[PDB]
C-alpha cells in the first residue's frame, strides 16, 4: 500500500524514523547541532578578525572613515562624529 | 551449465528464473516450491493411555487371619482388615462373629483401551530437510525431490538439481515431543519412572507390547463397609484422560511460520522460513548457440493494464522485428517486476503479449527478449 | 539490504544540499586567513 | 467503484457525468430528475 | 467496467467546429479525428 515517491524536500526524510531501527533522528540532531556551533565558531571568529582588521586604524586621526565602507558593516557604522 | 538461483522458502509462489549461458539464447524457467518437509529422527522413550485398576475378588476368611505378600506387581496394594462381618443376600458370609479377616489387593496395568487410545513419548534430533519442486522445464511440468542439504543430486531429464542448504535450520520441534494420533505438542514429558498421580505419565509402558509397566496412580485401599463385601479404595484420576483435556492446542495450530504439522511419520510441512538456494545442471540439450536464435531489434513496450498486486495483474505489449522465426525466453531485468512467460515463438515484424507481477505503483522495468532488451514503463493501481 | 550506517536521502535534491556544504566553513577560514595576511601588510608598512 | 456527483435539483434536464476508474476505460453516465416529491407527515386536526 | 487495453487507446487527436449555435438544445456540432489503436467502444465526455 504505496504509490508515493520518497521524499522531497525533509518532510518524507521525517518518515523514515518509522522504518530501520530506533536511532536515528535524534543523532542526525546532534550532527546539526555541531554543524551551527561551527557556523556560530566561526562568525565569532570573523567578529574577531573583523575587530584585528580595524585594529591599527583604531588609534586616531584621518584615515578611514576612508576604507570604513566599502567597509564590513563595521568599518563603519564607527568612523564618526 | 550450471544455473544457481536463490528463492524465498515459500511454498505455492512461481519464481521466474533468467537462465543466460554466453552465446546461447536465453531460457527462462518457472520454479514452485510444492512442499517442503522437516521430518525429525525420533527414539521413542515410553507410551501413555489410561490405566486400569485390577481388583480381584476379595479374600474374606472366615474365623482366621489373612496374611499379605509383597508382590512384584505396578502400584501393588495390600491389607488386611480384622473385624469383619460381611453379608450376603441370604445371610452373614462368615460362620463366626468375630475373628474374620478381609484381605483386600489391587494393582495397576494397561487399559484394554492401550493398543487403540494412547500417546507417544519421542525425543526429537536433527531433522533432515527435503523438498518437492515444481520446473516448468521445455513446455513441460516437472517434479524433483530432494533431500535440501546441497548434497542430494537428483536427475530429471538429464538436468542435475541440487538444492539447498536451507539458511534456516528453524524446526518447530523441542527436543522432547510427545504424538496423538494425528496432533503432536511439543513437551518437556516426564522420564520413564518419574510418572506423577493424575498427571501424564501415571502410567507409563516402554513399548505398547510390553508386559512390565511404571505405575504411580496413588492407590490406596480403605476399609469395607460394615457387613459389604467391596474393595474400596482413593485413587488420582487417569492422567492420560486430563492431559486429553489439558494438552491445548496441538503443534499444527501454534507452531510459527506457518508450519503444517502431520503424523506417520511425525514432519513439519511448509514452514515458510528463510530461503532455499537452488542448482541447475541443464544439458547441452536445451542450450541453443545466439547465432542459431532469432535476432531481435526494433523494440517497443506498451503497458495498456497493470494493478500492482500478489498476482500477475500487469499487461504488456511488446513490439520487435526478428531476423528468422524460432522460441524466444521472456525474462525481466528488474527484480522488482516478474513475467509469468518463460517462453513465447517470435516471427518478423510482430507482436507479443506478456502477464507481469509487481509492488510498485510507477513500474519502470526492462524485459528481455532472446538476447535483446526492451524498457516497459507501467502506471500500476492499487 | 547491503552495508552499515542507515543509508537513506536523494540525487538532485541530495546534492542541493551537499553543494552548499564544505561550502561556508571554508569560505569563513579563507577569509580569516586573508584579513591576516592583509594585517601582516600593514605591520610591515608601518 | 464508488462514482460521486452533484447535480442541481431541476427536473427534466439530462446531466452527464464521467465515470473515471483508474486503469478502466472512461465511462459517460446520463442522469434525468423525473420527479422530486417533498410528502409531509399529516396530523388531522379536524 | 472495460479495461483500458480491452479497449482503445487514442492518439493525434484534432478538433473542428464547422457549425455552432448557442442554445439550450444541442445547437453545436463538432468533428473529432483521431488514431485507434484497435476497434471499439469509447466514452465521450466534456471536460468543461
Do not use: C, M, V
Given at each position: 500500500s504505496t504509490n508515493g515517491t520518497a521524499h522531497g524536500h525533509p518532510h518524507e526524510i521525517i518518515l523514515y524514523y518509522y522504518e530501520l531501527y530506533p536511532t536515528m533522528t535524534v543523532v542526525i540532531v546532534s550532527v546539526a547541532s555541531f554543524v551551527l556551533l561551527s557556523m556560530v565558531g566561526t562568525a565569532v571568529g570573523m567578529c574577531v578578525c573583523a575587530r584585528r582588521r580595524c585594529i591599527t586604524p583604531y588609534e586616531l586621526t584621518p584615515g578611514a572613515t576612508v576604507p570604513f565602507?566599502?567597509?564590513?558593516?563595521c568599518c563603519v557604522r564607527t568612523t564618526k562624529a | 551449465y550450471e544455473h544457481v538461483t536463490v528463492i524465498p522458502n515459500t511454498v505455492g509462489v512461481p519464481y521466474k528464473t533468467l537462465v543466460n549461458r554466453p552465446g546461447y539464447s536465453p531460457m527462462v524457467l518457472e520454479m514452485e516450491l510444492l512442499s517442503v518437509t522437516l521430518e525429525p529422527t525420533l527414539s521413542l522413550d515410553y507410551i501413555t493411555c489410561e490405566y486400569k485398576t485390577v481388583i480381584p475378588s476379595p479374600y474374606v476368611k472366615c474365623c482366621g487371619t489373612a496374611e499379605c505378600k509383597d508382590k512384584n506387581l505396578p502400584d501393588y496394594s495390600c491389607k488386611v482388615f480384622t473385624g469383619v462381618y460381611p453379608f450376603m443376600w441370604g445371610g452373614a458370609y462368615c460362620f463366626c462373629d468375630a475373628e474374620n479377616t478381609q484381605l483386600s489387593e489391587a494393582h495397576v496395568e494397561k487399559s484394554e483401551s492401550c493398543k487403540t487410545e494412547f500417546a507417544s513419548a519421542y525425543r526429537a534430533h536433527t531433522a533432515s530437510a527435503s523438498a518437492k519442486l515444481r520446473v516448468l522445464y521445455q513446455g513441460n511440468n516437472i517434479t524433483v525431490t530432494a533431500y535440501?542439504?546441497?548434497d542430494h543430486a537428483v536427475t530429471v531429464k538429464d538436468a542435475k538439481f541440487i538444492v539447498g542448504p536451507m539458511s534456516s535450520a528453524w524446526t518447530p520441534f523441542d527436543n522432547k515431543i510427545v504424538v496423538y494420533k494425528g496432533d503432536v505438542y511439543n513437551m518437556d514429558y516426564p522420564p520413564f519412572g518419574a510418572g506423577r498421580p493424575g498427571q501424564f505419565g501415571d502410567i507409563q509402558s516402554?513399548?505398547?507390547?510390553?508386559k512390565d509397566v511404571y505405575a504411580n496412580t496413588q492407590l490406596v485401599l480403605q476399609r469395607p463397609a460394615a457387613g459389604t463385601v467391596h474393595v474400596p479404595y482413593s485413587q488420582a484420576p487417569s492422567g492420560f484422560k486430563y492431559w486429553l483435556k489439558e494438552?491445548?492446542?496441538s503443534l499444527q495450530h501454534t507452531?510459527?511460520?506457518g508450519c503444517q504439522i502431520a503424523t506417520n511419520p511425525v514432519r513439519a510441512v511448509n514452514c515458510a522460513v528463510g530461503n532455499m538456494p537452488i542448482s541447475i545442471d541443464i544439458p547441452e540439450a536445451a542450450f541453443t548457440r545466439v547465432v542459431d536464435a532469432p535476432s531481435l531489434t526494433d523494440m517497443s513496450c506498451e503497458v495498456p493494464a497493470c494493478t500492482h498486486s500478489s498476482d500477475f495483474g500487469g499487461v504488456a505489449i511488446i513490439k520487435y522485428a526478428a531476423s528468422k522465426k524460432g522460441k524466444c525466453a521472456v525474462h525481466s531485468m528488474t527484480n522488482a517486476v516478474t513475467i509469468r512467460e518463460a517462453e513465447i515463438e517470435v516471427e518478423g515484424n510482430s507482436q507479443l503479449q506478456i502477464s507481469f507481477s509487481t509492488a510498485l505503483a510507477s513500474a519502470e522495468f526492462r524485459v528481455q527478449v532472446c538476447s535483446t532488451q526492451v524498457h516497459c514503463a507501467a502506471e500500476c493501481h492499487p | 539490504h547491503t552495508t552499515l550506517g542507515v543509508q537513506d536521502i536523494s540525487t538532485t535534491a541530495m546534492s542541493w544540499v551537499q553543494k552548499?556544504?564544505?561550502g561556508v566553513g571554508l569560505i569563513v577560514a579563507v577569509a580569516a586567513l586573508i584579513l591576516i595576511v592583509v594585517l601582516c601588510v600593514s605591520f610591515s608598512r608601518h
Open positions: 565602507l566599502l567597509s564590513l558593516l | 535440501a542439504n546441497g516402554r513399548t505398547p507390547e510390553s494438552r491445548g492446542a507452531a510459527p511460520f | 552548499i556544504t564544505g
